[PDB]
Amino acid sequence: APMRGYKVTDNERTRKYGIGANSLEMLIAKAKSKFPLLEPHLYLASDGFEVSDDEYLKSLPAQTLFIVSGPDAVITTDADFEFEKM
Amino acid sequence: APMRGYKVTDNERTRKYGIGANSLEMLIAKAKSKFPLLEPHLYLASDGFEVSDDEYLKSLPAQTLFIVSGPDAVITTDADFEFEKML
Amino acid sequence: GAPMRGYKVTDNERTRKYGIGANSLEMLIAKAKSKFPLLEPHLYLASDGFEVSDDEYLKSLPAQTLFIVSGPDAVITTDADFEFEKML
Amino acid sequence: APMRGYKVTDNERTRKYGIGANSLEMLIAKAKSKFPLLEPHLYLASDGFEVSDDEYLKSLPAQTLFIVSGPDAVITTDADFEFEK
Amino acid sequence: APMRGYKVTDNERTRKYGIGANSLEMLIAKAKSKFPLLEPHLYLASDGFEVSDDEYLKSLPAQTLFIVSGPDAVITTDADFEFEK
Amino acid sequence: APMRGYKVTDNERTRKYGIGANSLEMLIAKAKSKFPLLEPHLYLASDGFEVSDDEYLKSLPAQTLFIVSGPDAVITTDADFEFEKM
Amino acid sequence: APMRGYKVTDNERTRKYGIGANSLEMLIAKAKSKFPLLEPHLYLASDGFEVSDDEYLKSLPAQTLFIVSGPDAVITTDADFEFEKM
Amino acid sequence: APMRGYKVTDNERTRKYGIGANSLEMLIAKAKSKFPLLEPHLYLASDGFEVSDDEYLKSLPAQTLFIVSGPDAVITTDADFEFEKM
Amino acid sequence: APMRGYKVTDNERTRKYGIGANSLEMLIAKAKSKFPLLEPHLYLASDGFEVSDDEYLKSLPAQTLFIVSGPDAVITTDADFEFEK
Amino acid sequence: APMRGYKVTDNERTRKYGIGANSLEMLIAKAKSKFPLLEPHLYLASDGFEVSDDEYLKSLPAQTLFIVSGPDAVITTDADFEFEKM
């Protein structure tokens, strides 16, 4: 498995990290080491879908932005977060 | 068979998952474990058509959005979903 | 040697709607029949109602074109008239 | 020769078929089999002009609608057919 | 293993250096000797994300511009830094 | 080990030399010998970054144009030198 | 060590010779015999840069066009020499 | 030492011969016997540069096209010749 | 000293022969016997240059096509000969 | 001296034989034995050139295809013969 770069942030978009990971578990592990989460879940910042499998993750292009969040927490999408603080 | 990413939701747009799958069989299995449906069928969110065979699935572009629902189900299409909540 | 492509099929009153992969007009017709009550089924463009008469005319068409499936030599409700007679 | 799709009907708009054909001859044969017509000829539904050779046929854009009818027949053009109705 | 070139600057973009480095460790070490910082961290000037791993660094193309700053420093992005100008 | 050709000028585009060098040290030596400065520093004419180590130098493509100037100096980049001159 | 071919001209582009040379010294020698200059120096027609050492010369691809001219003479680069001819 | 084939013509491209030669001198001799010039010099049809020494000649690829002309001669380049024919 | 094969034709491309020869003398001699011309000269079909020495000939790859013609006839080159057709 | 294998056919490629021959004479003889021609001559199927000399025959690689034909016959080349087939 090849290591790929991803951008991860919290739902309020305050901490922002780039992470190398060749699996959805490596990415989730690394995400939590850096985050106050009990069980962290990755969501596409674009539309908010949960990255559920390693397979759906490698579907995604490199440097895709994820929100890391609660287990079935609902995400402020990028369109909505950008629009809320204007 | 090549694994591709598809987006799946229930008709009420509450649970939203990305799923890797190389067959319509694998995709249906994975959706079933994540969804409260007995035997589940895939529908295009666009127009409400049923993905009936695996052949039609790889016809569709990756990251296509599906509604998952019961057999012989009529779907609130995306156009009709948006307009009725804005209402 | 024939490429599998995706088409969209419905009955004349738009209740059962399926997408079907098929590389021939006979493969599409077979699959349409398993999902439908009609005993000998024929494909019609939802647009204008023309019968897809041979396999070559089927590959003439772009993918995901919508067909009405119906009985032989039967005239179909065009999309325009179905979707305006519907709102009437 | 490339196979292309064309639209054929009678002068009365009763029978409507899509036909694949790489020649005006292949198209004429295929219309022949689906029609009760002795020696049948193709006309532009638009203008009523007879498609006289294979070359003028491949001049035309795909999915052009033709009236098929007897030779030297004068056609109810599309404007006149649907104005009569 | 392979030494690659990166461009590093401070948050007010006054001290600009190109640095060869085959690890995020080496890049950080060399960055610290040329910069007035205690524990220094690399961030993409583009969007401001923190370069967390050696792996995420080697994800990036060569001559990528980094801001080096404090541990949870929030950075004036290139877009915002050149707009204030 | 390998000799490569680089292009050197002062911040005023007066003297222009091509110099072969297998190190940033050799290049700096040869730069000073042709220049007035007491201790010389190399900068990318493109964006003005200082070539800090021999390793970053070999990062660069051959025949890259450098400015030589003092350790202090901030440089009129190529974009700005030929924007202001015109 | 290896003989290579170079193209040399004066700054007004009247006398044009191809010269075989494995050193910047051999090249400059041969240029001097064919030119009225006492101590002549080579410049890239492309850039106007002085080929300052033997090493930078072998940096260059064969059949590179050089101007031979005064010691610190500045050259009408061919881009501008060809621009003035119109 | 090794014989190579070169292609030679006059400036008006009326007479065209292929000539084997291992030196610029042998080539110059053979063109001399085939051409109405008193002291003949070789020029690249491409650029119009004078092949000045034997070394610059073996720089060149085989079957390179040369013009023969008088000393200090300016040549109709191939671009300029086959353009001005129309 | 080594015998090699070449292709010879007249300026018309009507008579076409393959000829084995280790010298420009042997080659033109053999063309002499198979062609009318009293003093025949070899020219490259490609560009029309006269093969002037035995040396320029062994420069050429085997099975190179020559026009054989008059002492200073100018050749319809292959580009032009097959364009007139 | 060394026997080599060649391939022979008539101008409409209906009778096809492989023939061993160490001379153009032997090849021509054996071909005439199998063919309805009085004095027969060999032509390259590829090019249509007459294999006029024994040395030119040994110039060619083994299994080159020949047309056997009349003394000054012009041949349907392989390119032209197999386009007439369409």
What does the buried/exposed string (b/e) look like for B59-70 if buried means 16 or more CB atoms within 10 Å of the residue's CB?
Answer: bbeebbbbbbbe
Say if the Cβ atoms of G47 and F5 lie within 8 Å.
no
- The CA-based angle F63-G79-G25, given to 5 degrees, is 50
Considering only CB atoms, which chain G residues are within 8 Å of H55?
3, 5, 19-21
Listed in sequence order, the DSSP H helices in chain I are: 24-34, 54-59, 78-84
The two tokens of residue G29 are 């020698």
Q: Greatest CA separation found in chain C?
A: 47
- CA gap C28, C13 in Å, rounded: 20
Instruction: Please check whether residue B18 touches A, CB under 8 A.
Output: yes
The two tokens of residue A79 are 């369109």
Long-range Cβ pairs for the range C75-79 (8 Å, 24+): C75/C49, C76/C12, C76/C44, C76/C46, C76/C49, C77/C12, C77/C13, C78/C46, C78/C47, C78/C48, C78/C49, C79/C46, C79/C47
- CA gap F53, E18 in Å, rounded: 8
H or E element at residue H81 = helix H78-84
Q: Among residues F1, F3, F2, F6, which one has the least CA distance to residue F65? A: F6
- CA gap F9, H78 in Å, rounded: 37
Considering only CB atoms, which chain B residues are within 8 Å of A50?
16-18
Considering only CB atoms, which chain C residues are within 8 Å of D26?
none
Contacts of J18 (CB under 8 A, 6+ apart): J5, J6, J7, J8, J63
Whole-angstrom CA distances from E76 to B36, B49, E18, F62 are 46, 48, 20, 33
Q: C-alpha I17: how far from its chain's center?
A: 10
Instruction: Please check whether residue D71 touches C, CB under 8 A.
Output: no
- CA gap B61, B5 in Å, rounded: 9
Q: Are E39 and F78 in contact (CB under 8 A)?
A: no
Length of chain B counted residue by residue: 87
Considering only CB atoms, which chain F residues are within 8 Å of E18?
44, 49-52, 56, 59-60
Say if the Cβ atoms of H63 and I58 lie within 8 Å.
no
- CA gap H10, H31 in Å, rounded: 10
Q: Are E50 and E41 in contact (CB under 8 A)?
A: yes
Whole-angstrom CA distances from A23 to A1, A2, A66, A71, E56 are 8, 9, 15, 19, 14
Please tell me whether residue I3 adopts helix, strand or coil conformation. Answer: coil
Instruction: Tell me how many residue pairs between chain H and chain I have CB atoms under 8 A apart.
Output: 47
The two tokens of residue I76 are 């319809």
Q: How far is A35 from chain B (nearest CA, A)?
A: 22
Considering only CB atoms, which chain G residues are within 8 Å of H49?
7, 16-18
- CA gap J40, G31 in Å, rounded: 66
- The CA-based angle F1-F6-F12, given to 5 degrees, is 145
The two tokens of residue C29 are 């017709």
**Dihedral sign, Cα of residue I67, residue I70, residue I76, residue I81:** negative
- CA gap C51, D17 in Å, rounded: 5
The two tokens of residue D84 are 């009569």
CA atoms within 13 A on the CB side of F8: 30
Q: Are A59 and A26 in contact (CB under 8 A)?
A: no
Structure-token match 């104005």, residue found: D83
What does the buried/exposed string (b/e) look like for H56-67 if buried means 16 or more CB atoms within 10 Å of the residue's CB?
Answer: bbbbbeebbbbb
The two tokens of residue F64 are 């890259």
Instruction: Please check whether residue G83 touches F, CB under 8 A.
Output: no
Say if the Cβ atoms of B48 and C17 lie within 8 Å.
yes
The two tokens of residue E29 are 């070490």
The two tokens of residue J6 are 């060649």
B71, B73, B77, B82: CA torsion to nearest 10: -110
Method: X-ray
Structure-token match 């790929």, residue found: A4
Length of chain A counted residue by residue: 86
- CA gap A32, I41 in Å, rounded: 87
- CA gap J43, J55 in Å, rounded: 14
F56, F60, F69, F76: which to substitute to probe chain E, counting the most E Cβ within 10 Å? F56
Q: Are F45 and F67 in contact (CB under 8 A)?
A: yes
Contacts of G71 (CB under 8 A, 6+ apart): G39, G41
Q: Among residues G59, E16, H36, A83, which one has the least CA distance to residue F27? A: G59
Query: Could you write out the DSSP letters of every residue in A7-74?
Result: EEEETT--SEEEEEESSHHHHHHHHHHTS--SS-EEEETTT--EE-SHHHHHHSPTT-EEEEE-TTPP
Query: Among all residues of chain F, which has the CA nearest to that of G55?
Result: F20
F19, F34, F82, F85: which to substitute to probe chain G, counting the most G Cβ within 10 Å? F19
Q: Are E4 and E20 in contact (CB under 8 A)?
A: yes
Main-chain phi, psi angles of F34, to 5 degrees: -95, 5
- CA gap F14, B87 in Å, rounded: 71
Main-chain phi, psi angles of I74, to 5 degrees: -100, 140
The two tokens of residue H45 are 């049809």
Considering only CB atoms, which chain J residues are within 8 Å of I29?
none
What does the buried/exposed string (b/e) look like for A40-54 if buried means 16 or more CB atoms within 10 Å of the residue's CB?
Answer: bbbbbbeebbbbbbb
Q: Are E34 and E9 in contact (CB under 8 A)?
A: no
Contacts of J57 (CB under 8 A, 6+ apart): I20, J23, J24, J27, J42, J51
**Dihedral sign, Cα of residue G54, residue G60, residue G61, residue G66:** negative
Query: Could you write out the DSSP letters of every residue in D5-23?
Result: EEEEE-TTS--EEEEEESS
Q: Among residues C15, C88, C80, C18, which one has the least CA distance to residue C49? A: C80
Considering only CB atoms, which chain H residues are within 8 Å of G64?
none
Q: Among residues A72, A17, A22, A83, which one has the least CA distance to residue A43? A: A72
Q: How far is A56 from chain B (nearest CA, A)?
A: 4
Q: Among residues J34, J68, J38, J36, which one has the least CA distance to residue J51? A: J68
Structure-token match 């042997």, residue found: I26
Which chains border E (3 or more CB–CB pairs < 8 Å)? A, F
- CA gap B78, B72 in Å, rounded: 18
- CA gap C54, D33 in Å, rounded: 12
Instruction: Please check whether residue F50 touches E, CB under 8 A.
Output: yes
Domains of chain G, CATH where assigned: 1-85 (3.10.20.10)
Q: C-alpha B42: how far from its chain's center?
A: 4
What does the buried/exposed string (b/e) look like for C31-55 if buried means 16 or more CB atoms within 10 Å of the residue's CB?
Answer: bbeebbeeeebbbbbbebbbbbbbb
Adjacent-strand bridge partners of C5: C22
DSSP single-letter state for residue I27: H
Instruction: Please check whether residue I77 touches H, CB under 8 A.
Output: no
